[PDB]
Amino acid sequence: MESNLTTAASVIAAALAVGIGSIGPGLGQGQAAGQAVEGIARQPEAEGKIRGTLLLSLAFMEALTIYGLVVALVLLFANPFV
Amino acid sequence: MESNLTTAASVIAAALAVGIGSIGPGLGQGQAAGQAVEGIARQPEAEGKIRGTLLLSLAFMEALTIYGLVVALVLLFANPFV
Amino acid sequence: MESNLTTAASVIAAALAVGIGSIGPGLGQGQAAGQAVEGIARQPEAEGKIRGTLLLSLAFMEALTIYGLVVALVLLFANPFV
Amino acid sequence: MESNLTTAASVIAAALAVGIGSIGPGLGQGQAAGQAVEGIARQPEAEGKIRGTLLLSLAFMEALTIYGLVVALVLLFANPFV
Amino acid sequence: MESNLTTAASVIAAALAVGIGSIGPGLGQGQAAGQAVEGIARQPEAEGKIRGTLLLSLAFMEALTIYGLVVALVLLFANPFV
Amino acid sequence: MESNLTTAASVIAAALAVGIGSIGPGLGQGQAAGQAVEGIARQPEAEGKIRGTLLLSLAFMEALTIYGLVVALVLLFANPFV
Amino acid sequence: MESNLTTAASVIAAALAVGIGSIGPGLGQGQAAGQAVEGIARQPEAEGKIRGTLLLSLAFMEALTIYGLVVALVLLFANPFV
Amino acid sequence: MESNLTTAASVIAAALAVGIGSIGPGLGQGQAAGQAVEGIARQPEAEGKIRGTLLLSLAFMEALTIYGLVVALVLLFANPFV
Amino acid sequence: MESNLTTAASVIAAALAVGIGSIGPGLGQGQAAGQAVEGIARQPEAEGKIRGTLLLSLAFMEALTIYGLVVALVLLFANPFV
Amino acid sequence: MESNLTTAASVIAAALAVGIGSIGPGLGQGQAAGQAVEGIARQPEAEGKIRGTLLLSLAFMEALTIYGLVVALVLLFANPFV
Amino acid sequence: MESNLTTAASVIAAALAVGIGSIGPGLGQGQAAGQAVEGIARQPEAEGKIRGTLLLSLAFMEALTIYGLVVALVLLFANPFV
Amino acid sequence: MESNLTTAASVIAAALAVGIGSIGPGLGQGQAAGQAVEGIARQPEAEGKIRGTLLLSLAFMEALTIYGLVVALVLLFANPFV
Amino acid sequence: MESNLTTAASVIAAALAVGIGSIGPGLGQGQAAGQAVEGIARQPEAEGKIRGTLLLSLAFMEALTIYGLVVALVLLFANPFV
Amino acid sequence: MESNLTTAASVIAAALAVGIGSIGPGLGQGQAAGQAVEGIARQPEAEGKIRGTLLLSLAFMEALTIYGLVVALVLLFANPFV
Amino acid sequence: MESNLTTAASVIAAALAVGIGSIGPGLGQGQAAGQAVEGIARQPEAEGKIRGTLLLSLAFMEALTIYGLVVALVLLFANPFV
C-alpha cells in the first residue's frame, strides 16, 4: 500500500520491541521459577506460599515484555505517522 | 508480487521477532526445567506440586516468545503497510 | 501521513527505550524473586516479611522499565517534533 | 525466477529465524536434560516421573525454535510479497 | 512541524538515556534485593534493619536511572536546540 | 548460469542457517551427555535408564539444527526464487 | 532553534554520558548493598557500622554517574559551542 | 574461471558453514569427553558403559558440524547457481 | 555559536571520557565496599581499620574517573582548538 | 596472476575456515585432556582406559577443524571458480 | 579557532585514552582493595602490613591510567601537530 | 612488486589464520597443562603417565594452529592466484 | 600546524596503545595484589617474602603497559613520518 | 618507499598476527603457571617434575604466538608481493 | 615529511600490536603471580622454588608482548615500506 522510510522503520521497530524485550524477562522468569521448584522439593508444605510469591513475580516480569508488545501493536495498528 | 523497502524490512523483522524472541525464554525454560527434574529426584513425593508450578512457569516464558510470533504473523499475514 | 528522518527515528527510538529498558530489570527481578522463594522455603513463617520486601523491590525495578515506556508513549502519542 | 531486495531479504530472514532461534532452546534443552540424567542416577526409581517432566519441558523449548521454522517456511513456500 | 538532524538525534538520544540507563541499576537492584530477602529468611528479627538499608540502597540506584529519565524529558519537553 | 543479489544471499543464508544453528544444540548436547556419563559412573545399574533419556534429549536438540539444515537444503536444491 | 552537526552530537553525547555512566555504578552499588544487608542479617548489632560504611560507599559510586549528569547538563544548558 | 558476486559469496559461505559450525560441537564434545574420563577414573569398571554412551554422544555432536561441511561441499562442488 | 567537526567531536569526547571512565571504577568500588561491609559484620571491632583502608581505596578508584572528568571539562571550558 | 573479487574472497575464506574452525575444538580438547590427566593422578591404574577414551575424543574434535582445513585446501588448490 | 581532521581526532583520542585506560585499573583496584579489607577483618593485627602492600599495589594500578592521562594532556596542551 | 585486491587480502588472511587460530588451542593447552601439574603435585608417582597423556594432548591442540600456519604459508609462499 | 591522515591516525594510535594496553595489566595486577594481601592476612610472618614476589610481578605487568606508553610517546614526540 | 593497498594491509596484518596471536597463549600460560606454583607449594618435593612438565607446556603455548611472529616478520622483511 | 595510506596504517598497526598484545599476557601474569603469593603464604619454606618457577613463567608471558613491541618498533624505526 505505502512504503517509505517510516513504514520500514516501523516494522523493524515492532520486532525489536518484542524480540529484545523478551531477553531479560525470559531469563529472569527461569531463574525465579527454578528457585521455586527447588524450594518446593525442599519444603512441599510451603508450596502454597511459594507459588503465590512466584506468580506475583512472574507477573511483574511478564509485564516488562508486554510493554514492548504494546509498542509493537501501536506501531502496527495505531501508527501515529503512517 | 511487490518488492519495496518495507516488504524487505517486514520479512527481516518477522525473523528477528521470533529468532531473538526465543533466546531468553529458551534459556529460562531450561533453567527452570533443570531445577524441576532435580527436585523430583530429591523428593519424588512432591512431583505433582513441582510439575504444576513448572507448567505455570513454562507458560509465562512461552508467552514471551509467542508475542514475537504474533508480531511476525501480523507482518506476514496482516501487514498494515504492504 | 508524514514520513521523514524524525518520524522514522522516533519509531526506532520508542522500541529501543522499552526493548533495552527491560533487560536489566527483567534479570534483576528474577534474581530477587528467586532468592525470595528460596527464603520462603527455608523459613515459611517469614513469608509475610519476605513478600513485602520483595514487592517493594519489584516495584523499584519495574519503574526503571516504565520510564522507557513513558518515553516510548511520548514519542508515539505526544511527539514534540513530528 | 525472481530477484529483488525482498527475495534476498527473505532468504536471509529464513536462515536467521531458524539459526538464531535455536540458540536459547538448544542451550536450555541441554541444561534440563543434564539435570534429568543426573537425577535418574541419583534416584533411578524416579525415572518415570523425571522423564515425563523432562519431555514436557523439551516440547516447550522445541516449540520456540519451531516458531522460527514456521516463519522460515512461510518465507520460502508461502511468501506474501514475492 | 519540524524534522532535521537534531530532532532525529534528540528522539534516539532520549531512548538511549533511559534504555541504557536502566541496565546497571536494574541488575544492581536485583542483587541487593535478593540478598535482602535471603537475609530476612535467615534472621527475621532483623527485617526492619534490613528493609531500611535496602530502601536507602534502592533509592541510590533508582536515582542513576532517573538522571537518564531527566535528560530524556529535557530532550522531549524542554529541548534547548529544536 | 546465474548470479544476482538473491543467489548471493541464498548461499550466505544457507551457511548461516547450519553454522549458527549448531551453536546452542552443540553446547547443549555436550552438557547433557557429560551429565549422563557422570551419572553412569555414579550409578552403573541405571545406565539403561540414563542412556534412554539421553537419547531422547539428543534427538530433540539435534532436530533444532536439522531445521537449519532443511532451510539450507531448500535454498540450495529447491530455491523458490532463483 | 538551531540544528547542525554539533547540536545533534550534543544531544547524543548527553544521553551517552548518563546512560553509559550509570552501568558500573549501578552494578557496584548493588554488590555493596547486597553484602551490607547480608551482613546485617549475620550481625544485626553491627547495623550502624555497616550502614555508615555503605552510605559512604554509595556516595562515592553515585558521584561517578553524577559526573556524567554534569556533562549532560552542561551540554544541554550551558553549551560552550552551540 | 568466473568471478561474480555469487562465486565470491559462495566461498565465504563455505568457510562460514564449517568454521562457525565447529564452535558449539567442539566445546560440547570437550565437556562430554571430560566428564567421561573423570567418570572412568571414578569407576573404572563402568568404562564400557561410559565409552558407549560417550561415543553415541560424540556422533550426535559431530553430525552437527558435518551438516556445515555438507553445505560447504555443495557450494564448492555442486553449486546450484554458479 | 560555532559548529564544525571539532566542536562535534569535542562534545562526544567529553561524554565518552566520563561515561566510559566510570565503568571500571564503579564496579571496583562496589567490589571493595561489599567486602568491607562483610568484614565489619564479621569483626565489628575492626571497623575503624576497615573503614580507613576502604576510604583510601575508594579515593584511588574515584580519581580514575575524575581524570575522565578533567578531560571532559577541558574540552568544554578550556578547549585548545575550538 | 589473476585478481578479482573471487580470488580475494577465496583467500579470506580459507583463513576464516581454519582460524575460526580451531576455536571450539581447541577449547574442547583442553577441557577433555585436563580431566584426563586429573583422572590419571586420581587413579593411575586407569591410565589405559582413560587414555583410550581421551584419544577417541581428541580425534572427534580434531576432525572438526580438519573440515575447515579441507575447505581451505579446496579453496586454494582445487578452486571451482578461479 | 582551528578545526580539521587532526583536531577532531585529538579530542576523541584524549577521551579514549583516559576513558578506556580506567577500565582495567578500576576493576583491579577493587579486587585488591576487597581482599585487603577482608584480610583486615580476618586478622586485624596485620592491618599495617596489609595496608602497606595494598598502597603499593594501588600505586602501580593507578599509574596505568595516569599514562592515559598523560597522553590526553599532551594531545590537549602540548599537541605536536595542531 | 604487485599490489591488487588479492595480494592485500592474502596478507590479511595469513595473519587471521595464525592469529585467530591460536586462541582456542592457546587457552586449551593452558587448561590441560594446569591440570597436569596439579596432578603431578597430587601424585608424583604418576608423573610419567601424566606427562605422556599431556604430550599427546598438546600435540593435538598444537596441530590445530599449525593448520592455520599452513594456510598462511601457502598464501605467502605458494599463492595460487597472485 | 599540519593536518593529514597520518597525524590524525597518529593521535588515535597513541591513545589506543596506552588505553587498550592498560586493560590486561590493570586486571592482572589486581588479581595478584588481592592474593598477596590475602596471603599476608593468612601468614603475617611471610610478609617480606610475599611483598618481594608481588613487587617483581607488578613490575613485569607494569612494563606491558609501558611498551604502549613508549609507542604513544614516539608517535607524539619522535614521529617518523609527520 | 612504496605505498599501496598491499603495503598498508601488510603492516596491519603484521600487528594483528602477533597482537591477536598472544591472547590465548598469554591466558593459557598464566593458567598453567599458576597451577604449577600452587602445586609446588603443596608438594615442594615434586618441584623438579612440575617444572619440567610446565616448561614443556610453556614451549608449546609460546610456539603458537611465534607462528604469528613468523608471519609478521615475513610480511615486514620477506614480503612476497610488495 | 610523509603522509599516505601506509604511514597511517603503520602508526595504527604499531599501537594495535602492543595494545592488543598486552591483554592475554597481562591477565595471565596476574593469575600466575596471584597463585605464587598464595603458595608462599601457604608454604613459606618453598618460596625459593615458587619464585624461580614464577620468574620463568613471567618471562615466557612477557615475551609474547615483546613480540608485539618488536613489530611496533620495526614499524616506527625500521619501516620497510615508508
Ligand SMILES: OC[C@H]1O[C@H](O[C@H]2[C@H](O)[C@@H](O)[C@H](OCCCCC3CCCCC3)O[C@@H]2CO)[C@H](O)[C@@H](O)[C@@H]1O
Ligand atoms: O520515504 C523514503 C523515500 O526515500 C527513498 O530513498 C531511499 C534511500 O536512497 C535509501 O538510502 C533508503 O535505504 C536506506 C535506509 C536504511 C533502511 C532502514 C534502516 C533501519 C530502519 C529500518 C530500515 O531507502 C529509501 C527508500 O525508502 C526514495 O527516494 C523514495 O522512494 C522513498 O519514499
Ligand SMILES: OC[C@H]1O[C@H](O[C@H]2[C@H](O)[C@@H](O)[C@H](OCCCCC3CCCCC3)O[C@@H]2CO)[C@H](O)[C@@H](O)[C@@H]1O
Ligand atoms: O525498485 C525500487 C523499489 O525499492 C525501493 O526501495 C529501495 C530503497 O530506496 C533502497 O535504498 C534500498 O537499498 C537499501 C538497502 C538496505 C537493506 C535493508 C536493511 C534493513 C531493512 C531491510 C533491508 O533498496 C530498495 C529496493 O527495493 C522502494 O521502496 C520501492 O517503492 C521500489 O519498488
Ligand SMILES: OC[C@H]1O[C@H](O[C@H]2[C@H](O)[C@@H](O)[C@H](OCCCCC3CCCCC3)O[C@@H]2CO)[C@H](O)[C@@H](O)[C@@H]1O
Ligand atoms: O527527512 C525527510 C526525508 O526523508 C528521507 O530521508 C532519508 C532517506 O529516505 C533514508 O533512505 C536515509 O536513511 C539513512 C539511514 C538512517 C535511517 C534512520 C537511522 C536511525 C533510526 C531511524 C532510521 O536518510 C535520509 C535522511 O534524510 C528522504 O530524503 C525524503 O524522501 C524525505 O524528504
Ligand SMILES: OC[C@H]1O[C@H](O[C@H]2[C@H](O)[C@@H](O)[C@H](OCCCCC3CCCCC3)O[C@@H]2CO)[C@H](O)[C@@H](O)[C@@H]1O
Ligand atoms: O532499482 C531497484 C534496485 O533494487 C535492487 O537493488 C538493490 C540491490 O539488489 C542491493 O544489493 C543493494 O543493497 C542491498 C543491501 C544488501 C542486501 C540486503 C541486505 C540486508 C539483508 C537482505 C539483503 O541495494 C539496491 C537498492 O538500493 C535490485 O537488485 C537492483 O537490481 C535494482 O537496481
Ligand SMILES: OC[C@H]1O[C@H](O[C@H]2[C@H](O)[C@@H](O)[C@H](OCCCCC3CCCCC3)O[C@@H]2CO)[C@H](O)[C@@H](O)[C@@H]1O
Ligand atoms: O540540520 C538538519 C539537516 O538534516 C538533513 O541533513 C542530513 C540528514 O539528517 C540526512 O539526510 C543525512 O543524515 C542521516 C543519517 C544520520 C541519521 C542519524 C544517525 C544517528 C542520530 C539519529 C539519526 O545527512 C544529511 C546531510 O545533509 C537535511 O539534509 C538538512 O536539510 C537539514 O537541515
Ligand SMILES: OC[C@H]1O[C@H](O[C@H]2[C@H](O)[C@@H](O)[C@H](OCCCCC3CCCCC3)O[C@@H]2CO)[C@H](O)[C@@H](O)[C@@H]1O
Ligand atoms: O537482483 C540482482 C541484482 O544484483 C545486482 O545489484 C546489486 C548487486 O548485488 C551489488 O552490485 C550491490 O550489492 C552488493 C552488496 C551486497 C552483497 C550481499 C550482502 C549480504 C547478502 C549476500 C551478499 O548492489 C547492487 C545494486 O544494483 C546487479 O546490479 C543487478 O543487475 C542484479 O539484477
Ligand SMILES: OC[C@H]1O[C@H](O[C@H]2[C@H](O)[C@@H](O)[C@H](OCCCCC3CCCCC3)O[C@@H]2CO)[C@H](O)[C@@H](O)[C@@H]1O
Ligand atoms: O553543509 C554542512 C552540513 O552540516 C550538517 O550536515 C551533516 C548532516 O546533518 C549529518 O546527518 C551527516 O552525517 C552526520 C553523522 C550522523 C549524525 C551524527 C553521528 C554521530 C553522533 C552525532 C550525530 O553529515 C553532514 C555533514 O557531512 C547539516 O545538518 C547539513 O544541513 C549541512 O549540509
Ligand SMILES: OC[C@H]1O[C@H](O[C@H]2[C@H](O)[C@@H](O)[C@H](OCCCCC3CCCCC3)O[C@@H]2CO)[C@H](O)[C@@H](O)[C@@H]1O
Ligand atoms: O557480479 C558480477 C560482478 O562482480 C563485481 O561486483 C562486485 C564488485 O566487484 C565488488 O567490489 C563489490 O563487493 C562489495 C562487498 C561485498 C562482497 C561480498 C560480500 C559478502 C561475502 C562475499 C563478498 O560488489 C559488487 C557486487 O556486484 C563487479 O561489479 C563486476 O566485475 C562483475 O561483473
Ligand SMILES: OC[C@H]1O[C@H](O[C@H]2[C@H](O)[C@@H](O)[C@H](OCCCCC3CCCCC3)O[C@@H]2CO)[C@H](O)[C@@H](O)[C@@H]1O
Ligand atoms: O558546515 C560545514 C561545517 O562542518 C565541517 O565539518 C563537516 C565535515 O566535513 C563532515 O565530514 C561532517 O560529517 C561527518 C559526520 C561524522 C560524525 C562525527 C563522528 C565522530 C565525531 C563526531 C561526529 O560534518 C561536518 C559538518 O559540521 C567543518 O569542520 C566546519 O568548518 C564547517 O563549519
Ligand SMILES: OC[C@H]1O[C@H](O[C@H]2[C@H](O)[C@@H](O)[C@H](OCCCCC3CCCCC3)O[C@@H]2CO)[C@H](O)[C@@H](O)[C@@H]1O
Ligand atoms: O572482479 C572484481 C572487479 O571489480 C573491481 O571493482 C572493485 C570494487 O570497486 C571495490 O568495491 C571492491 O572492493 C570492495 C570489496 C570488498 C573486499 C572483499 C570483502 C570480503 C571478501 C574479501 C574481500 O574491489 C573491486 C576490485 O576487485 C574492478 O572494477 C575490477 O578490476 C575487478 O576485477
Ligand SMILES: OC[C@H]1O[C@H](O[C@H]2[C@H](O)[C@@H](O)[C@H](OCCCCC3CCCCC3)O[C@@H]2CO)[C@H](O)[C@@H](O)[C@@H]1O
Ligand atoms: O582537515 C580536514 C579537511 O577535510 C574536510 O573534509 C571532511 C570530509 O569530507 C569528511 O569525510 C570528514 O569527516 C569524516 C571523518 C571521520 C571523523 C573522525 C573519525 C574518528 C576520528 C575523529 C573524527 O571531515 C572532513 C572535515 O574535517 C574539508 O574538506 C575541510 O574543511 C577539512 O579541513
Ligand SMILES: OC[C@H]1O[C@H](O[C@H]2[C@H](O)[C@@H](O)[C@H](OCCCCC3CCCCC3)O[C@@H]2CO)[C@H](O)[C@@H](O)[C@@H]1O
Ligand atoms: O591500482 C588498482 C589496483 O587495485 C585493484 O583493487 C582495488 C579495488 O578495486 C578497490 O576496491 C580496493 O579498495 C577496497 C578496500 C578494501 C580493503 C580490503 C578489505 C579486506 C580485504 C583486504 C583489504 O583497493 C584496491 C587497490 O589495490 C585491483 O585489484 C588491481 O588489479 C589494481 O592493480
Ligand SMILES: OC[C@H]1O[C@H](O[C@H]2[C@H](O)[C@@H](O)[C@H](OCCCCC3CCCCC3)O[C@@H]2CO)[C@H](O)[C@@H](O)[C@@H]1O
Ligand atoms: O591526508 C591529507 C588530507 O587529509 C584529509 O583527508 C582525510 C579527510 O579529511 C577525512 O575526512 C577522511 O577521514 C575518513 C575517516 C578516517 C579518519 C581516520 C581513521 C583512523 C583513525 C584516524 C582518523 O579521510 C581523508 C583521508 O585522506 C583531506 O583529504 C585533506 O584536507 C588533506 O589534504
Ligand SMILES: OC[C@H]1O[C@H](O[C@H]2[C@H](O)[C@@H](O)[C@H](OCCCCC3CCCCC3)O[C@@H]2CO)[C@H](O)[C@@H](O)[C@@H]1O
Ligand atoms: O588507484 C588505486 C588506489 O590504490 C590505493 O587506493 C586505496 C586507498 O589507499 C585506500 O585508503 C582506500 O581504502 C582502503 C581501505 C582502508 C585501508 C585498508 C583497510 C583494511 C586493512 C588494510 C588497510 O581504497 C583505495 C582503493 O579503492 C592507493 O593508495 C590510491 O592512491 C589509489 O587511488
Ligand SMILES: OC[C@H]1O[C@H](O[C@H]2[C@H](O)[C@@H](O)[C@H](OCCCCC3CCCCC3)O[C@@H]2CO)[C@H](O)[C@@H](O)[C@@H]1O
Ligand atoms: O598510498 C597512499 C595514498 O593515500 C591516499 O589514498 C587514500 C587515503 O588514505 C584516504 O583518502 C582514503 O582512505 C582513508 C580511509 C582509511 C584510513 C585507514 C583505515 C585503517 C588504517 C589506518 C587509516 O582513500 C584514499 C584512496 O585514494 C591518497 O589519496 C593518495 O594520494 C596516497 O598516495
